[PDB]
Design a protein around this ligand. Structure first.
Ligand SMILES: [N]C(=O)C1=[C][N+]([C]2O[C]([C]OP(=O)([O-])OP([O])(=O)O[C][C]3O[C](N4[C]=NC5=C4N=[C]N=C5[N])[C]([O])[C]3[O])[C]([O])[C]2O[B@@]2([O])C3=C([C]=[C][C]=[C]3)[C]=NN2C([N])=O)=[C][C]=[C]1
Ligand SMILES: [N]C(=O)C1=[C][N+]([C]2O[C]([C]OP(=O)([O-])OP([O])(=O)O[C][C]3O[C](N4[C]=NC5=C4N=[C]N=C5[N])[C]([O])[C]3[O])[C]([O])[C]2O[B@@]2([O])C3=C([C]=[C][C]=[C]3)[C]=NN2C([N])=O)=[C][C]=[C]1
Ligand SMILES: [N]C(=O)C1=[C][N+]([C]2O[C]([C]OP(=O)([O-])OP([O])(=O)O[C][C]3O[C](N4[C]=NC5=C4N=[C]N=C5[N])[C]([O])[C]3[O])[C]([O])[C]2O[B@@]2([O])C3=C([C]=[C][C]=[C]3)[C]=NN2C([N])=O)=[C][C]=[C]1
Ligand SMILES: [N]C(=O)C1=[C][N+]([C]2O[C]([C]OP(=O)([O-])OP([O])(=O)O[C][C]3O[C](N4[C]=NC5=C4N=[C]N=C5[N])[C]([O])[C]3[O])[C]([O])[C]2O[B@@]2([O])C3=C([C]=[C][C]=[C]3)[C]=NN2C([N])=O)=[C][C]=[C]1
Lengths: 248, 247, 247, 248
């Protein structure tokens, strides 16, 4: 596979529906050696077994809200991989009350802080903590959403956090490029991981279907492989062309 | 002039060189009645003098880091302006260590938190706190910068906070549009007040850096009923710098 | 008003509903002296009457399909305005068959050629033909549309021609900036004058379609010294429509 | 390879330095069956032999200035491939006088017409002429340049033609998507196929090198493969992050 010889850490695997699962799947298909993180001691067993099916028993706890947890995860990772070739950041959160109704009425100082901290800062917090561990030719990948670029009802403060995240992609690419690391995002179309949101995108997307975790995983695999050696700092739309049409 | 009849609150005046100052001068030139905030004790006197020179004695304390300080400022404002026509948000900050050197090395969780809180969250915090006071036809304005869109050396986490601020403009414009409020930003070129300035002078299509007068005249337009068809827009007032490459 | 002292040429007036008409009214309201072109014999009378109502008797024929017609129009213009301050380009056309149905089936080599020639090339053709006549401080303006940026059904090859027109704005702004000329576009929302209009009304943040008055007030700003810090910009005057999704 | 079972037409191969060559190379590496066009009876032998090295003796004359030539090329192609899975458009031209000096002084009605006709219209002229021949899952690819988005000295009217071309990508994707065809562009960084232009991009690009025809070919291969099934109507920057940095 075109990831042979690569070791990639994959965050965000929570179930077989997770975008991160589809990415891990495609990467394993392409010959990558994988490691997995999990947020809390609840997902622990569930992720250990997803890992197993994908050639791996590197399953490590990490809450990205805490610098200590990120450090201790990469110290653990360093025991089996003193060096490695990048990671997939597939993590986001905002408090539930943030994401319903009029944006201005819903947003709070605290809601804004957590959304940005978990959905955007954590991407660079992970890069900081593993920087000396990355091989030349490493690639970092995060997952964004059209909410960054357009005002979408209910998406609310997550849109700001995703915009911060896409700028984070650019400043990371810029800072880490000279030492041979690429940094990109995929802006994915909607996937079941909102019933009206999915339905709308299907009717008006150029490809006339919603994208799958397989489509996103294949794009992800490519973007973390040396095939994409020419691509850095880019948000690639894997939404079947939805964002480039209007009034279909 | 073209803002006669409008009541506009102007934040962020700190000196005669402040963008907010060029904006307040331009708006007063166009007949706006103005009100002013100041952040702390150190700036109160400067802002009173500027306000007096521009016909105003509404000078109110406001530290956008705190919800209570925004709320009491608007309660104070409501005694003289029970309704008004919008505000200019000309505020941002990141701790000094954030803005020098390699971005990935410089940024910290706390530095990121403050940059976004002060430079982005505060725009919608002010809007939330005065929403019921805004007349139909109101306009809100904030100030952003090309670092929101491109990776600029040393700008670092402030680029992320400005990107969050630009999306805030879109989300606020969309939320507030139905009750008659527009929300825009000006992405200003760097203002001569250091290596970046010499660069922008040479390669900007109009062959100079923009001034606070340029910015102020665009800002007054964007807060006036002349810009009635413009909302959720980041307008580049950088002399065309951003749209050129390899000049 | 804010265009006193400016001499601006206005193309594209065809009726009281023309965007160019709202623009000419707004500029005359702001003290500009105006000049007018008309495309052909059929429109001459309408444009003379409008010009007279707005204080002008400079009404000149110009078909931008031909180099000689642009050159003689500007030679005519130079007898009354040896120098002047810019022009509003409000011209586009594609043959009728281009603009209905599947894009790939509708477009032809000839239809593409004409759409780009008339709707894009003509902006720089006019600029070339009057370059030496423009005062420092001059501004050129053209009218574009969201189809330049997104695939819109039925707009078809006109979207490609508008994209070429937007890049023309950037290349002209960059070329002409050093001698004191700015060049911008307004990307106007669809104006009520059919299913698209009902759509834009419901989902546009300001909850209405923009009017030729909205467009005209932005255009007058962009041709005035108030927009001195703005060049090579496509400003969206569509009420925020383009920056929202799934409304 | 991830193009196995695909048949792709590749235009624009003029020499071993051509972007189209690097694309053909990568595609053949990935198992695609190839066909090649050539502009004039001069390149004929030279292209026939490039083809041979890449598993192919489908080498067909085509001048994209002429509808008849495009039609007769696809009729010929139809003799060996009644159906096929898309094509690479790697064609552009403007008269030499267009591309030097002040844009406004250099541009002419005729220069503008030819630049747009050859660099932009020809992409959709090819799609029109082979539409009934495309399999579901087909992909079309063209090559653009940052000149479309920014004003670059000397690039002049080619910038307008490339902007027209990128809009063409979107309207094509929109029109052809429902019948199962994707359409994308790669905006490539500078490649030797200007000595100061290359040099500048090397110093200030995040990856600190200019991209190669191999980087572009690998991205091209991906974008014409089913791995990119989620991507349509997109201009992918394969310029090593150059366009997303400023003042480096
Ligand atoms: N889905 C869709 O459609 C989309 C998405 N996106 C994105 O991506 C990401 C991922 O997510 P998903 O896959 O989808 O889901 P899940 O599976 O559930 O996952 C999540 C995750 O995360 C994590 N976390 C949290 N928190 C935390 C964590 N970790 C660690 N630490 C901490 N603290 C968990 O665990 C899991 O695993 C994301 O990012 C997304 O985004 B978003 O915003 C969205 C959605 C939807 C739609 C849109 C958007 C969802 N979600 N989100 C979030 N969360 O953020 C993109 C596109 C599309
Ligand atoms: N300059 C230039 O070039 C620019 C700018 N920009 C922007 O805008 C704004 C404003 O700025 P300026 O005017 O310039 O400055 P100053 O005067 O200093 O001011 C500021 C203000 O704020 C305030 N604050 C703070 N914090 C706070 C406040 N208030 C309240 N509360 C609180 N807490 C003070 O007081 C004053 O007044 C801004 O936003 C800006 O941005 B930035 O980032 C930038 C710069 C430069 C360049 C670029 C950018 C600077 N600064 N910044 C900040 N700070 O943020 C835009 C464009 C341009
Ligand atoms: N409307 C709306 O919605 C819009 C529009 N836009 C644009 O802008 C311009 C103008 O339009 P309007 O005003 O609307 O129309 P009218 O009135 O018809 O006008 C036109 C003009 O032009 C001229 N021409 C032609 N050809 C020629 C000329 N001149 C000279 N020479 C030659 N050859 C006539 O005469 C008249 O005056 C334009 O550009 C527009 O665009 B488009 O595309 C559109 C529409 C609609 C919608 C969208 C778009 C219509 N039309 N168009 C054309 N035509 O092109 C913008 C936005 C909006
Ligand atoms: N190079 C670089 O850097 C770049 C490029 N790009 C693009 O891509 C394409 C391709 O080109 P190249 O590869 O580069 O080159 P070559 O090899 O030489 O090729 C060309 C071709 O074409 C053809 N043709 C022409 N005409 C015609 C034809 N065919 C057919 N028919 C007709 N009529 C020939 O044969 C050959 O093969 C292109 O498109 C490009 O673009 B551009 O604009 C550019 C350049 C440079 C830089 C930039 C840009 C060059 N060139 N070009 C043109 N031509 O167009 C992209 C990016 C980069």
């Amino acid at each position: 596979g075109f990831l042979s010889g690569k070791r990639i850490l994959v965050t965000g695997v929570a179930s077989k529906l997770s975008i991160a699962y589809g990415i891990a799947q495609a990467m394993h298909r392409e010959g990558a050696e994988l490691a997995f993180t999990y947020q809390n001691d609840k997902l622990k067993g569930r992720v250990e077994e997803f890992a197993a099916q994908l050639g791996s028993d590197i399953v490590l706890q990490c809450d990205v809200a805490e610098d200590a947890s990120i450090d201790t995860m990469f110290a653990e990772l360093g025991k089996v991989w003193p060096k490695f070739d990048g990671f997939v950041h597939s993590i986001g959160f905002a408090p539930g009350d943030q994401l319903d109704g009029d944006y201005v009425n819903a947003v709070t100082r605290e809601g804004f802080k957590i959304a940005h901290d978990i959905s955007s800062y954590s991407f660079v917090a992970m890069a900081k903590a593993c920087r000396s561990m990355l091989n030349p030719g490493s690639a970092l990948l995060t997952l964004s959403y059209l909410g960054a670029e357009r005002a979408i009802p209910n998406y609310n403060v997550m849109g700001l956090a995703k915009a911060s995240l896409e700028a984070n992609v650019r400043y990371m690419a810029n800072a880490m490029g000279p030492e041979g690391v690429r940094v990109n995002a995929i802006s994915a179309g909607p996937i079941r991981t909102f019933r009206k949101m999915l339905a709308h995108c299907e009717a008006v997307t150029p490809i006339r279907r919603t994208v799958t975790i397989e489509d996103v995983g294949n794009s992800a695999a490519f973007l973390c492989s040396d095939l994409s050696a020419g691509i850095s700092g880019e948000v690639v739309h894997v939404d079947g062309g939805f964002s480039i049409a209007a009034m279909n």
